[PDB]
Amino acid sequence: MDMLFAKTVVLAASAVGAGTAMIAGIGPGVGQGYAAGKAVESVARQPEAKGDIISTMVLGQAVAESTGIYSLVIALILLYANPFVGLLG
Amino acid sequence: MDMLFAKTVVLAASAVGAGTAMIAGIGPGVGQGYAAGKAVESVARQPEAKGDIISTMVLGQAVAESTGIYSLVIALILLYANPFVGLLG
Amino acid sequence: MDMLFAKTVVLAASAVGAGTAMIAGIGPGVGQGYAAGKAVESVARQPEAKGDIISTMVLGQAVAESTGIYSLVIALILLYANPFVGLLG
Amino acid sequence: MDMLFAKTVVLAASAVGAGTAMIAGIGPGVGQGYAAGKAVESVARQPEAKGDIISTMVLGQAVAESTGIYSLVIALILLYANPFVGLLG
Amino acid sequence: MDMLFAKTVVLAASAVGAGTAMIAGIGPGVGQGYAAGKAVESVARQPEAKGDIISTMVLGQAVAESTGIYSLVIALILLYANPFVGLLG
Amino acid sequence: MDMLFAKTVVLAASAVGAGTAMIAGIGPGVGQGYAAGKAVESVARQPEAKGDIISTMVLGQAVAESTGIYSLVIALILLYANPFVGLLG
Amino acid sequence: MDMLFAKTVVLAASAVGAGTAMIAGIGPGVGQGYAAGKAVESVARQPEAKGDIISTMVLGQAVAESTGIYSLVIALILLYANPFVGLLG
Amino acid sequence: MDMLFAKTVVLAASAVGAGTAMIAGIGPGVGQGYAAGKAVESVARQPEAKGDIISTMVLGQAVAESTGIYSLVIALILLYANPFVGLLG
Amino acid sequence: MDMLFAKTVVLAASAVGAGTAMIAGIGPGVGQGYAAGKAVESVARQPEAKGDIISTMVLGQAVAESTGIYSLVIALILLYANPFVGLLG
Amino acid sequence: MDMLFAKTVVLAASAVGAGTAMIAGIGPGVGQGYAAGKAVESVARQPEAKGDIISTMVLGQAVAESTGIYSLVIALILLYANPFVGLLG
Amino acid sequence: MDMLFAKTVVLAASAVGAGTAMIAGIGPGVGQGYAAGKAVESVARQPEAKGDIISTMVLGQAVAESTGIYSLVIALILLYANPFVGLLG
Numbered sequence: 001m002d003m004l005f006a007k008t009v010v011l012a013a014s015a016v017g018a019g020t021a022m023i024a025g026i027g028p029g030v031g032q033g034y035a036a037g038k039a040v041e042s043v044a045r046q047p048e049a050k051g052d053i054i055s056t057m058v059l060g061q062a063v064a065e066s067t068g069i070y071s072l073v074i075a076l077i078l079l080y081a082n083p084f085v086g087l088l089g
Numbered sequence: 090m091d092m093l094f095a096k097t098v099v100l101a102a103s104a105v106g107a108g109t110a111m112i113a114g115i116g117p118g119v120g121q122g123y124a125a126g127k128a129v130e131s132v133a134r135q136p137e138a139k140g141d142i143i144s145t146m147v148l149g150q151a152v153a154e155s156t157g158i159y160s161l162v163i164a165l166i167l168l169y170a171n172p173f174v175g176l177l178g
Numbered sequence: 179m180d181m182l183f184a185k186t187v188v189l190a191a192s193a194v195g196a197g198t199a200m201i202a203g204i205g206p207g208v209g210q211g212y213a214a215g216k217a218v219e220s221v222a223r224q225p226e227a228k229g230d231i232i233s234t235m236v237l238g239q240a241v242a243e244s245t246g247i248y249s250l251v252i253a254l255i256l257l258y259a260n261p262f263v264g265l266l267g
Numbered sequence: 268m269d270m271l272f273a274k275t276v277v278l279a280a281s282a283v284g285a286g287t288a289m290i291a292g293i294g295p296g297v298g299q300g301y302a303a304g305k306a307v308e309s310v311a312r313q314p315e316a317k318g319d320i321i322s323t324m325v326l327g328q329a330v331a332e333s334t335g336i337y338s339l340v341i342a343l344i345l346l347y348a349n350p351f352v353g354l355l356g
Numbered sequence: 357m358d359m360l361f362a363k364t365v366v367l368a369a370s371a372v373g374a375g376t377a378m379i380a381g382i383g384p385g386v387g388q389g390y391a392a393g394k395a396v397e398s399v400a401r402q403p404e405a406k407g408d409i410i411s412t413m414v415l416g417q418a419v420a421e422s423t424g425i426y427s428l429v430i431a432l433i434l435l436y437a438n439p440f441v442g443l444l445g
Numbered sequence: 446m447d448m449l450f451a452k453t454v455v456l457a458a459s460a461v462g463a464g465t466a467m468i469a470g471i472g473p474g475v476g477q478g479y480a481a482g483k484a485v486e487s488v489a490r491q492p493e494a495k496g497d498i499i500s501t502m503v504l505g506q507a508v509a510e511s512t513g514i515y516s517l518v519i520a521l522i523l524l525y526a527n528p529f530v531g532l533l534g
Numbered sequence: 535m536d537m538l539f540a541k542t543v544v545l546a547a548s549a550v551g552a553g554t555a556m557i558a559g560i561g562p563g564v565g566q567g568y569a570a571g572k573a574v575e576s577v578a579r580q581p582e583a584k585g586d587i588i589s590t591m592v593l594g595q596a597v598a599e600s601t602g603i604y605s606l607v608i609a610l611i612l613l614y615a616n617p618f619v620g621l622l623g
Numbered sequence: 624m625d626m627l628f629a630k631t632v633v634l635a636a637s638a639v640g641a642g643t644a645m646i647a648g649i650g651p652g653v654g655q656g657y658a659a660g661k662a663v664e665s666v667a668r669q670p671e672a673k674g675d676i677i678s679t680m681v682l683g684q685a686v687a688e689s690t691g692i693y694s695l696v697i698a699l700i701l702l703y704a705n706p707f708v709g710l711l712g
Numbered sequence: 713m714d715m716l717f718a719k720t721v722v723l724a725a726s727a728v729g730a731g732t733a734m735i736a737g738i739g740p741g742v743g744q745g746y747a748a749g750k751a752v753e754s755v756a757r758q759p760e761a762k763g764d765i766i767s768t769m770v771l772g773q774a775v776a777e778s779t780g781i782y783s784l785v786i787a788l789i790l791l792y793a794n795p796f797v798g799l800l801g
Numbered sequence: 802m803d804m805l806f807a808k809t810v811v812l813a814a815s816a817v818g819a820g821t822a823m824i825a826g827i828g829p830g831v832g833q834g835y836a837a838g839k840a841v842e843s844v845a846r847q848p849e850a851k852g853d854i855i856s857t858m859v860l861g862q863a864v865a866e867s868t869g870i871y872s873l874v875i876a877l878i879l880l881y882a883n884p885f886v887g888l889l890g
Numbered sequence: 891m892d893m894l895f896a897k898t899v900v901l902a903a904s905a906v907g908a909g910t911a912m913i914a915g916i917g918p919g920v921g922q923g924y925a926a927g928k929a930v931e932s933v934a935r936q937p938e939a940k941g942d943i944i945s946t947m948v949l950g951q952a953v954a955e956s957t958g959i960y961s962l963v964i965a966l967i968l969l970y971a972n973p974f975v976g977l978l979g
């Protein structure tokens with residue numbers, strides 16, 4: 001193989017791999033939306049708990065975000081700091 | 090490989106990768122719709138908290154939107170600021 | 179590669195990418211339908227609140243629509259303002 | 268490439284793209300069925316709210332339909348007003 | 357390309373596209389089954405509402421059916437009124 | 446292309462298309478099982494309502510079955526009344 | 535094409551098609567398990583109505599099984615009464 | 624084609640088909656786990672029903688297992704009693 | 713075909729088939745986690761019945777595990793007791 | 802085939818197989834998160850049974866982890882103790 | 891095969907495998923978001939137990955994170971400590 005062909009196929013696979021990783025983003029959208037619904041329900045019933053409600057919502061939602069960030073980091077590595085092109089030849 | 094062939098396959102993979110990333114959009118639609126349902130329930134029950142209900146709904150929904158935006162950004166990079174074509178040759 | 183072959187494969191991948199992006203439309207249908215169910219249950223108990231119920235339903239449903247629109251925009255770019263064909267050669 | 272080969276591969280990809288877009292139809296079926304179930308439960312407890320129940324059900328269900336329509340439009344463009352065949356050569 | 361080869365690949369893709377579109381049928385089965393479950397609980401508790409329960413169930417279920425029909429129409433077009441074979445050559 | 450090659454690839458795609466369509470069967474199993482659970486719950490609490498419970502369960506379940514039948518019909522057409530082999534040559 | 539090559543590719547596609555159809559089995563497992571859970575809850579509260587509970591559970595579960603059987607039939611046709619090999623040549 | 628090539632491709636497709644069929648196992652795990660949760664909840668609230676609870680749980684769970692077994696049987700046929708290799712040549 | 717080529721493609725397909733079968737593991741994780749949540753709720757309410765809550769939880773969870781084990785067995789057969797390599801030639 | 806080509810394709814398939822197995826990890830995340838939510842609500846209600854709540858949560862969550870571990874083991878075998886490379890030639 | 895071709899295909903498959911493993915991230919986002927919603931609902935009722943609530947939420951969420959981490963580790967091994975390139979030749 002020539003080197004341009006090698007990079008071409010490794011980078012093409014990297015594009016597919018990056019987009020596939022981003023499918024993980026479904027999870028945080030579902031879970032965080034649930035937490036938001038419960039926060040809405042609680043502050044209508046208890047306006048006085050609005051600090052605790054919102055601070056607790058944000059903490060718990062932040063934890064649920066992490067796997068969306070992991071996928072994003074893997075995608076950005078593949079696009080901008082691609083680790084395979086340097087292993088070639 | 091010639092250079093037109095190299096770009097052709099890298100850009101074709103980028104189109105597939107971009108569309109695949111957008112599958113993440115399922116999540117925010119599910120979660121944010123749940124939050125909207127709880128907000129509807131709560132206005133009817135306690136009309137006086139409409140202000141808090143809606144502001145809390147929008148904050149929590151904004152957080153649930155983020156992974157849909159991340160996918161969108163990855164797709165737009167692949168289509169409009171493609172990082173692979175410049176690594177070629 | 180000749181130029182017709184280059185466009186052919188880039189546009190074929192664009193068709194697949196566009197259709198795949200549209201899978202995101204599952205999410206808004208699920209979430210918005212939930213919000214509609216809660217609106218129905220509340221109108222029934224609390225007709226004095228039909229105003230707020232429906233306006234709140236529509237606002238929250240509008241937010242849940244956004245990722246379905248993002249996919250639609252990516253699909254229409256790929257079909258009607260294709261950004262790859264101009265990068266070729 | 269000859270022109271018949273170019274059209275053949277672009278149209279074959281368009282067929283796959285169209286069918287894939289239609290997977291979005293899962294969402295409206297799930298969400299609208301939920302809204303129908305809530306409408307049933309309320310007409311039987313509150314026969315006097317049948318007008319508001321059904322009109323609210325239909326409005327909210329109409330909103331949940333939109334992403335199923337978007338996919339259908341993309342599929343029908345690819346089959347009947349295909350935008351790629353004219354970009355060729 | 358010869359013309360038999362062109363039709364062969366376009367029709368093969370059409371078969372895959374048609375079957376893929378039919379995956380949408382998951383949605384109506386889930387949503388309509390939910391609506392049926394609510395109708396069952398309701399007639400038991402409020403048998404003097406049977407007429408409304410069942411008529412409301414059927415109306416709301418009919419709306420939830422539509423995206424299953426759209427997929428079916430796309431599949432039957434691809435199999436029986438295939439729009440690509442005539443664009444060839 | 447020779448004619449045996451043409452039929453071979455069209456029929457191979459038909460087999461894949463048929464099996465893929467059958468994935469729709471997930472939906473009716475989920476929804477109809479829900480309806481069955483509600484029927485069980487109601488006959489235990491209201492044994493004297495068994496008549497309307499079971500007739501309502503079966504009607505609503507029948508409606509939820511339809512998209513599973515549509516997929517089955519598409520699969521059986523592709524296997525036993527294949528519409529593509531006759532369009533060839 | 536020779537005839538062994540024709541059968542080889544048609545039967546290979548049939549194996550993939552058969553396994554794919556079997557994915558439908560997810561649905562009955564989910565729905566029937568729900569119905570079983572409701573039956574358990576119900577006998578605990580109404581020991582007396584065990585006869586009806588169980589007979590209703592089994593009837594409703596039988597209906598939810600049907601699409602799992604349809605997929606199984608399509609798979610067994612493709613493996614043991616394959617309809618494509620006889621259309622060849 | 625030679626005969627070793629024919630068997631190679633039919634058996635490779637059989638391996639993919641077998642693994643794909645096993646995806647059905649998701650369903651019974653979800654449904655049976657639900658039934659187990661309800662059994663747990665009811666042993667607490669009504670300890671005089673432990674016998675009915677567990678026997679009903681196991682019956683209903685057995686029914687929910689069937690589609691996981693069907694997939695398993697199809698996989699084991701493809702691996703150990705492969706029906707395609709004998710149709711060859 | 714030579715024999716090394718035959719084994720290579722059969723074993724490559726076996727690796728893909730094995731990994732695909734393992735997707736079934738989603739189901740037990742979902743269902744068993746539900747059962748664990750109900751057990752947590754039933755001990756809190758009745759700390760004194762901890763032994764029958766837990767014995768029922770474990771029995772019902774064991775049943776929900778079975779399809780995860782079936783997939784695991786199919787994967788381990790394909791990797792360590794591969795049935796296809798001996799059918800070759 | 803030469804031996805480097807044989808290993809190359811078997812190891813490439815092993816990488817795809819390993820990543821696919823890891824999709825199973827969705828299940829434990831969903832189920833274990835449910836169990837955690839129930840533990841949180843139960844310690845709010847009942848601070849006495851906290852030891853029991855947490856010990857029950859951890860036991861039930863451990864059981865729900867197992868299929869995530871099985872996939873992980875299959876992936877690590879394919880990457881670090883690959884059983885196919887030794888069957889070659 | 892030459893050695894550059896061998897590495898190229900093994901690394902391209904590794905990119906696809908890595909991205910696919912990251913799909914597991916859906917699970918923790920869903921489950922952890924649920925746990926966050928319950929934590930919100932419970933502080934508002936029981937402000938006095940915020941201690942217990944948040945520490946229990948974080949412990950249970952940490953357990954639900956594990957399979958997202960496993961996928962991440964497999965992806966980072968494939969990208970940065972690739973075990974296949976050294977088995978080659």
Ligand SMILES: CCCCCCCCCO
Binds near residue numbers: 009013098102902906
């Ligand atoms: C999924 C990986 C795509 C890599 C395709 C490269 C094809 C190049 C052919 O010359």
Ligand SMILES: CCCCCCCCCO
Binds near residue numbers: 012105
């Ligand atoms: C999924 C990546 C698609 C790349 C296909 C390129 C094929 C070019 C063949 O000449």
Ligand SMILES: CCCCCCCCCO
Binds near residue numbers: 187191194280
């Ligand atoms: C998924 C991308 C499809 C691109 C296929 C191009 C194949 C042309 C072969 O000569």
Ligand SMILES: CCCCCCCCCO
Binds near residue numbers: 279280283369
């Ligand atoms: C998914 C896109 C299908 C296009 C396949 C075209 C293959 C023609 C080969 O000569």
Ligand SMILES: CCCCCCCCCO
Binds near residue numbers: 365
């Ligand atoms: C998914 C589209 C299938 C089209 C395959 C055609 C292959 C013909 C090769 O000669």
Ligand SMILES: CCCCCCCCCO
Binds near residue numbers: 368372458461
């Ligand atoms: C998915 C459609 C399968 C068709 C593959 C035909 C391959 C024949 C190659 O000569």
Ligand SMILES: CCCCCCCCCO
Binds near residue numbers: 457461546550632636
């Ligand atoms: C999915 C259908 C598989 C058919 C592959 C046949 C390939 C034979 C190549 O020579």
Ligand SMILES: CCCCCCCCCO
Binds near residue numbers: 546639721
């Ligand atoms: C999915 C079916 C795999 C069959 C691949 C056979 C390829 C052999 C090529 O010579």
Ligand SMILES: CCCCCCCCCO
Binds near residue numbers: 725728810
């Ligand atoms: C999914 C099965 C993979 C088999 C691919 C074998 C390709 C060998 C080509 O020479």
Ligand SMILES: CCCCCCCCCO
Binds near residue numbers: 813
């Ligand atoms: C899914 C398995 C990938 C194996 C691809 C091997 C292709 C090598 C071609 O030279």
Ligand SMILES: CCCCCCCCCO
Binds near residue numbers: 009013817903
């Ligand atoms: C899914 C694995 C992608 C490997 C494709 C390699 C194709 C190289 C052809 O020369």
Ligand code: NA
Binds near residue numbers: 066955958
């Ligand atoms: Na997380």
Ligand code: NA
Binds near residue numbers: 029068152153154
């Ligand atoms: Na988010």
Ligand code: NA
Binds near residue numbers: 118154242244245
């Ligand atoms: Na949105």
Ligand code: NA
Binds near residue numbers: 207330332333
């Ligand atoms: Na919509």
Ligand code: NA
Binds near residue numbers: 295296332419420
């Ligand atoms: Na509809």
